[PDB]
Motif scaffolding. Structure first.
Motif, mmCIF file in Angstrom:
data_model
loop_
_atom_site.group_PDB
_atom_site.id
_atom_site.type_symbol
_atom_site.label_atom_id
_atom_site.label_comp_id
_atom_site.label_asym_id
_atom_site.label_seq_id
_atom_site.Cartn_x
_atom_site.Cartn_y
_atom_site.Cartn_z
ATOM 1 N N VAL A 2 42.269 11.737 63.312
ATOM 2 C CA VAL A 2 41.118 11.163 62.808
ATOM 3 C C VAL A 2 40.107 12.485 61.905
ATOM 4 O O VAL A 2 40.189 13.503 62.789
ATOM 5 C CB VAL A 2 40.230 10.716 63.931
ATOM 6 C CG1 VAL A 2 38.949 10.056 63.367
ATOM 7 C CG2 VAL A 2 41.114 9.529 64.503
ATOM 8 N N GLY A 3 39.469 12.365 60.882
ATOM 9 C CA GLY A 3 39.008 13.233 60.370
ATOM 10 C C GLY A 3 39.365 14.304 59.734
ATOM 11 O O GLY A 3 39.118 15.503 59.569
ATOM 12 N N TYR A 5 42.804 15.539 56.804
ATOM 13 C CA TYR A 5 43.267 15.395 55.363
ATOM 14 C C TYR A 5 44.739 15.480 55.066
ATOM 15 O O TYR A 5 45.445 15.696 56.068
ATOM 16 C CB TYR A 5 42.679 16.962 54.475
ATOM 17 C CG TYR A 5 43.238 18.203 55.450
ATOM 18 C CD1 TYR A 5 44.476 18.564 54.648
ATOM 19 C CD2 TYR A 5 42.623 18.916 56.384
ATOM 20 C CE1 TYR A 5 45.100 19.827 55.153
ATOM 21 C CE2 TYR A 5 43.355 19.928 56.838
ATOM 22 C CZ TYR A 5 44.639 20.358 56.414
ATOM 23 O OH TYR A 5 45.157 21.573 56.935
ATOM 24 N N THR A 124 44.003 6.773 62.216
ATOM 25 C CA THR A 124 43.022 7.625 61.439
ATOM 26 C C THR A 124 41.544 7.081 61.663
ATOM 27 O O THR A 124 40.568 7.713 61.276
ATOM 28 C CB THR A 124 43.105 7.648 59.912
ATOM 29 O OG1 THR A 124 42.775 6.325 59.492
ATOM 30 C CG2 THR A 124 44.472 7.998 59.467
ATOM 31 N N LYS A 125 41.546 6.120 62.762
ATOM 32 C CA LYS A 125 40.070 5.571 62.844
ATOM 33 C C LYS A 125 39.845 5.672 64.439
ATOM 34 O O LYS A 125 40.567 5.516 65.239
ATOM 35 C CB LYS A 125 40.182 4.043 62.538
ATOM 36 C CG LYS A 125 40.249 3.757 61.139
ATOM 37 C CD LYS A 125 38.825 3.630 60.374
ATOM 38 C CE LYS A 125 37.971 4.577 60.435
ATOM 39 N NZ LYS A 125 36.664 4.182 59.801
ATOM 40 N N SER A 126 38.556 6.027 64.578
ATOM 41 C CA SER A 126 38.235 6.180 65.922
ATOM 42 C C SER A 126 37.663 5.102 66.788
ATOM 43 O O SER A 126 37.526 4.588 67.798
ATOM 44 C CB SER A 126 37.104 7.232 66.345
ATOM 45 O OG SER A 126 35.839 6.819 65.253
ATOM 46 N N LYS A 136 49.036 13.466 57.629
ATOM 47 C CA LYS A 136 47.801 13.994 58.107
ATOM 48 C C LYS A 136 47.750 15.152 58.541
ATOM 49 O O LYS A 136 48.462 15.491 59.473
ATOM 50 C CB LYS A 136 46.906 13.050 58.513
ATOM 51 C CG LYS A 136 46.886 11.632 57.826
ATOM 52 C CD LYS A 136 45.877 12.110 56.386
ATOM 53 C CE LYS A 136 45.650 10.709 55.631
ATOM 54 N NZ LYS A 136 45.037 10.999 53.986
ATOM 55 N N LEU A 138 44.989 18.546 60.502
ATOM 56 C CA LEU A 138 43.700 18.881 61.089
ATOM 57 C C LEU A 138 43.753 20.189 61.632
ATOM 58 O O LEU A 138 44.543 20.506 62.383
ATOM 59 C CB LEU A 138 43.329 17.928 62.346
ATOM 60 C CG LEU A 138 42.100 18.147 62.813
ATOM 61 C CD1 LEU A 138 40.884 18.002 62.018
ATOM 62 C CD2 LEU A 138 42.097 17.353 64.082
ATOM 63 N N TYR A 165 37.120 19.116 68.900
ATOM 64 C CA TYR A 165 35.490 19.032 68.682
ATOM 65 C C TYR A 165 34.845 18.431 69.635
ATOM 66 O O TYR A 165 35.289 17.250 70.008
ATOM 67 C CB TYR A 165 35.211 18.826 67.316
ATOM 68 C CG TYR A 165 36.077 19.592 65.986
ATOM 69 C CD1 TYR A 165 37.262 19.317 65.692
ATOM 70 C CD2 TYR A 165 35.425 20.474 65.983
ATOM 71 C CE1 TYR A 165 37.874 20.239 65.012
ATOM 72 C CE2 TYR A 165 36.018 21.390 64.748
ATOM 73 C CZ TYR A 165 37.422 20.938 64.372
ATOM 74 O OH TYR A 165 37.909 21.914 63.422
ATOM 75 N N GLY A 169 34.503 12.784 65.875
ATOM 76 C CA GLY A 169 34.747 13.270 64.672
ATOM 77 C C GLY A 169 35.899 13.295 64.091
ATOM 78 O O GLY A 169 36.638 13.029 63.200
ATOM 79 N N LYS A 170 36.806 14.426 64.710
ATOM 80 C CA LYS A 170 38.057 15.036 64.387
ATOM 81 C C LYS A 170 38.797 15.119 65.666
ATOM 82 O O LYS A 170 38.238 15.612 66.735
ATOM 83 C CB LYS A 170 37.698 16.313 63.881
ATOM 84 C CG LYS A 170 36.954 16.492 62.460
ATOM 85 C CD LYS A 170 36.776 17.786 62.044
ATOM 86 C CE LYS A 170 36.017 17.748 60.884
ATOM 87 N NZ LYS A 170 35.937 19.205 60.404
ATOM 88 N N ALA A 198 38.590 11.086 69.068
ATOM 89 C CA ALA A 198 37.534 11.432 68.383
ATOM 90 C C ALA A 198 36.115 11.160 68.996
ATOM 91 O O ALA A 198 35.165 11.090 68.180
ATOM 92 C CB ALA A 198 37.439 11.105 67.087
#
Ligand SMILES: [Ca+2]
Length: 223
Positions: A2-3, A5, A124-126, A136, A138, A165, A169-170, A198
């Motif tokens: 999640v969050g 690239y 990829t979704k929280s 992906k 991170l 974090y 978000g990530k 996340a």
């Protein structure tokens, strides 16, 4: 993830996909015949997929090799996930090239603040569900144990470490399990668990690989 690239095709050559009719977990190639993953990713009939980027399109650099033997850590605890690590031996040696390479094991443990690279084909979704077809990536720092312990509802042992974090978000997520956490060119962690994905005050928990190097070396040398 999640969050994160899009890593880029084969930029993480040691990343593997465990497949049992579909992708279900990640792993890391540590030499031409062995893969390291999470014990909670165990399943019978595992096929290891190397050189993958888009897991739904044959791109030309893949190598599909079935496991000949799986070895879950002797002290794996399915309730706490303590010792969440597993070794997988390939039926045949992988062909090492620029897109398929092994990652080195640690000679020492990493410290808080150190930047690491986490990768996977997980959700990829929280607050929902969306699985990517391409790998992906991170960048995440190792955090003090306190960071994960403060709001944790589960036991966090000395065989686990905190990375991510605190403001959410990530984070890694479902489907990323078993995947690598690489810091300073060494495999320091294995995606293990977390409360949701996340979420604020809830960073990811990873298997601390530096505590298992002896077991890993002894096991592959004897099998
Ligand atoms: Ca592919």
């Amino acid at each position: 993830i999640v969050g994160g690239y899009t890593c880029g095709a084969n930029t993480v050559p040691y990343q593997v996909s465990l497949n049992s009719g579909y992708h279900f977990c990640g792993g890391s190639l540590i030499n031409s015949q062995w893969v390291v993953s999470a014990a909670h990713c165990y399943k019978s009939g595992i096929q290891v997929r190397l050189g993958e980027d888009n897991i739904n399109v044959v791109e030309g650099n893949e190598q599909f090799i079935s496991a000949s033997k799986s070895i879950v850590h002797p002290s794996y605890n399915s309730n706490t996930l303590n010792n969440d690590i597993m070794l997988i031996k390939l039926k045949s040696a992988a062909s090492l090239n620029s897109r398929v390479a092994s990652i080195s094991l640690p000679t020492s443990c990493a410290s808080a603040g150190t930047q690491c690279l986490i990768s996977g084909w997980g959700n990829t979704k929280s607050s929902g569900t969306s699985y990517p077809d391409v790998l992906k990536c991170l960048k995440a720092p190792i955090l003090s144990d306190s960071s994960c312990k403060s709001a944790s509802s589960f036991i966090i042992t000395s065989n686990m470490f905190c990375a991510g974090y605190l403001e959410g978000g990530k984070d890694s997520c479902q489907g990323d399990s078993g995947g690598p956490v690489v810091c300073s060119g060494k495999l320091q962690g294995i995606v293990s668990w977390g409360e949701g994905c996340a979420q604020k005050n809830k960073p990811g928990v990873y298997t601390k690989v530096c505590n298992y190097v002896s077991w890993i070396k002894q096991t592959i040398a004897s099998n």
